[PDB]
Amino acid sequence: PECFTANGADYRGTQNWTALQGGKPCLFWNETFQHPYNTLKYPNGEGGLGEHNYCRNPDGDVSPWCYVGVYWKYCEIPACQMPGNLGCYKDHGNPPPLTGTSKTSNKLTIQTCISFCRSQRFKFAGMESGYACFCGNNPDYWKYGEAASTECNSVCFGDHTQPCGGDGRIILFDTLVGACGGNYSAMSSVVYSPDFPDTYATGRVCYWTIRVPGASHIHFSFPLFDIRDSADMVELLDGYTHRVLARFHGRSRPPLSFNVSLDFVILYFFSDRINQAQGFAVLYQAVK
Amino acid sequence: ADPEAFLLFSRRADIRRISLETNNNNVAIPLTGVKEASALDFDVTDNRIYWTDISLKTISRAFMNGSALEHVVEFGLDYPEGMAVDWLGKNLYWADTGTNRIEVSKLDGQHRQVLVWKDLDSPRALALDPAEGFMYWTEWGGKPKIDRAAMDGSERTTLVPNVGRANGLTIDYAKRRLYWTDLDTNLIESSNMLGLNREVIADDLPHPFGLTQYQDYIYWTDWSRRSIERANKTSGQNRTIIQGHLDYVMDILVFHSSRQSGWNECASSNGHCSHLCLAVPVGGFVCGCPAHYSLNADNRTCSAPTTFLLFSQKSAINRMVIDEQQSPDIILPIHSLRNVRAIDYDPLDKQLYWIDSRQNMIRKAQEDGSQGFTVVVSEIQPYDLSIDIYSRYIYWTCEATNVINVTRLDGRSVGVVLKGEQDRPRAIVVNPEKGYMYFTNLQERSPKIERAALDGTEREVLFFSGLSKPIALALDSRLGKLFWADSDLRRIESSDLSGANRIVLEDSNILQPVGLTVFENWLYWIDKQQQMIEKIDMTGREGRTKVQARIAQLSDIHAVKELNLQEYRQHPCAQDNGGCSHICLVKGDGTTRCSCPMHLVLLQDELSCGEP
Amino acid sequence: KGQEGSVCLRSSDCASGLCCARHFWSKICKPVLKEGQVCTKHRRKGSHGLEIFQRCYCGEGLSCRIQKRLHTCQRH
Ligand SMILES: [Ca+2]
What we know:
The complex is a heterotrimer of chains A (288), B (612) and C (76).
Chain A: E1 65-67, E2 72-74, E3 85-90, E4 101-104, H1 110-119, E5 124-128, E6 132-136, E7 169-174, E8 182-184, E9 188-192, E10 205-211, E11 217-226, E12 233-238, E13 244-249, E14 257-260, E15 264-270, E16 279-287
Parallel strand pairs in A: 8-10
Antiparallel strand pairs in A: 1-2, 3-7, 4-6, 5-6, 5-7, 9-16, 10-15, 11-14, 11-16, 12-13, 12-15
Chain B: E1 6-11, E2 14-18, E3 26-28, E4 37-43, E5 48-53, E6 58-63, E7 70-73, E8 82-86, E9 91-96, E10 101-106, E11 113-116, E12 123-129, E13 134-139, E14 145-150, E15 157-160, E16 166-172, E17 177-182, E18 187-192, E19 199-202, E20 208-214, E21 217-222, E22 227-232, E23 240-244, E24 252-255, E25 276-279, E26 285-288, E27 294-295, E28 302-303, E29 308-312, E30 317-320, E31 330-331, E32 340-346, E33 351-356, E34 361-365, E35 373-376, E36 382-388, E37 393-398, E38 403-408, E39 413-419, E40 425-431, E41 436-442, E42 447-452, E43 460-463, E44 470-476, E45 481-486, E46 491-496, E47 503-506, E48 513-519, E49 522-527, E50 532-537, E51 545-549, E52 556-560, H1 565-569, E53 601-602, E54 609-610
Antiparallel strand pairs in B: 1-2, 1-24, 2-3, 4-5, 5-6, 6-7, 8-9, 9-10, 10-11, 12-13, 13-14, 14-15, 16-17, 17-18, 18-19, 20-21, 21-22, 22-23, 25-26, 27-28, 29-30, 29-52, 30-31, 32-33, 33-34, 34-35, 36-37, 37-38, 38-39, 40-41, 41-42, 42-43, 44-45, 45-46, 46-47, 48-49, 49-50, 50-51, 53-54
Chain C: E1 18-23, E2 26-31, E3 38-39, H1 46-50, E4 63-66, E5 71-74
Antiparallel strand pairs in C: 1-2, 3-5, 4-5
Bound molecules: calcium ion.
Calcium ion binds at residues 202, 229, 232, 271-272, 274-276 of chain A.
């Protein structure tokens, strides 16, 4: 996966088309001087801009895009889909994809819908039209069919940097995403900060149990790591002994990746009472 | 005024004030229960601020200190996105995109009148000019435009057609120019007071929304940049951001005395007008009246609508007229209305009566809304009522005790006129001109319509077959016709007051009738599930006509004719109740008796009533 | 099902000649645009997200093209 954010802000891939089928070719960021975003405004490669025409998201909108009175289009990138984001699916009405429960909120985000569905004990959470949340334990949320991720690009009413479905189009999320704690038993999965994809709240103390019976070692990587303060810190603990393996805070970034020869690791997170940030996304990969 | 001009702006949950300086103090106005504030105006003379709430569906006001929080308008509003204060005449103008009406009332709220209703398609912003007597508004239809009219809703005309969704319409009174933001093209344009000499002030703006002006600057709000900015009004340069980090700023305004300057005849003694004083460009002003009221020949005083038709929903009682200009139906502003079941009107005192189904009481109030009074309370469960206008009584049916109980308008009870073990009176309509009453007796297995005298004597079953749910009754005293509607059988039938000549008027494309009333030579009725007011010609000249549609939860409908006071007093129970203590009956030969309820008996006076 | 002005979530909730578009911070059934009527066309990309007064799409066999500045529904 090339994205671990809700809107592909960290996308640095090689797709230079608005869609792989029936799309339009993107313009180069080093020759879009008519427009706001280009290489002259942003030297040092800020926001992933450079001498290329690959899709990017520098402005902080709901999805990656490129220039092409239509002078831009959203990029339908298959790889750019954050682990946890199960996909954009259709909603033809009665019954809905997720049948558990539902609410409406004028301050809705991806997390606030997830936190609502997690609070009612539902595994899946789905946002529609920017403001309508839906919850359920339904295995057939795909019943009406999968839609293109560009069709689920209506802004969340609380946060304009996030996608929250569309007109008869539901973006789904596993309720483990942004939960203050949880158990992980898959070969490979991602663990986000609390309240992701919103900014993590102050005074959080959350811990996630990664345990893969049979794994010789686990390959931890940090595709996203935006922790503000030194008092804020992400810790990896040995599951058996509870010994602190590593400490990562604002003034101590993690590597690209590192191996831990264990089948049982406890990721911890501690948030202070000063400043908030986007958070993190720890992709682990067990090896047998 | 000597205080410096300060900037007010609405922002969803709260309204805040700031100075003209960059990054100066920012304080919220201490208001309570504000959910979604949109439009914004003020009154410097009263030291008051006015705003519209699209979540509450209201137009409120309060002082700068936060005290005197009161809802000025809170009925018949869907999306009041535009609003403005007539400071000279002391009136409150507003525009509603959902209902498609430009309305006006006093600043406190009373005497509401619709100025523009025909040919409106979502009027958004609103800018008044009571010194000159013009009002200007932006329109967000299929073809958006900026129209102009006189402040009495006269002389309507399109000022600039070729424009997008214009917002923040504001008048530069010193140099005589109109300014507005455009949401489609994202620019601030300017033109003179006739919509010519059109110039673009600022084109390179991301999302300019709210707008106002003062001295030699324009102040606008931006959704993209999240800021309140200003610039030179003519040039569009000398640009400075006043405030930042402001999410979803709706409207912006300059609070100063020089903004509300000028003068007209309405500022002096309200132009001697009885209700409303409306400024005009040619002739100074003109005296307006409330909705439906007729302005008298003297061009000052008003009289309430002579003839009108009342129809009630679950949570409101409406009023409509039969005008050539299809004048729009209004919601009567009664605060006491929660769950109405039936309605009836007293044309002598001009007051509205209804049955609250939840609270179980017969309440009273005039069309204004004031002079509220409960006449019957508790067990008692009123179903339907019918007012004897001559004897000053209400004949109503109780679902609890199963009786036709009669009560005075003031409150005190007359007595029960009809009771039985197996009897269940439900629908009720009186005919005191002839001296009879008509009611649906829904007995178990066998429903039936019955006639009786107003004391409960001379009972007889008019119809006992071809019935299932006799739900609503209505009669015409002039032509001598009785009408009833059936819910289950899905039809409206008719006959004479005697019972002969039973004919089915309509029995197709009807689902659930719940009310009947006669207006001139037309039988108006209401359908709950279809959600339509429809009518048919009783003579049979003209066809079936649909009056209105999309009216949810229709309960009861009632026509009101103007009371002929001379012809009223020809009725012998009109004056002194015919000398009777309780019921005043009319004989077949036009002479009056005096009768009593069940529990009383007529005495040797043949007037008073005593117990057996 | 939903009438013009009634609260909706999806366009399926509304009637035949209506679509579900956002007004302020809730969606209501608005009518679909016919030939000649003004349609939405976003200049900036962020203005799509900031739009709280959404118009419906142009009808069957209509495209949101420029007038001959604003855009109107015109045939192909
Ligand atoms: Ca913190």
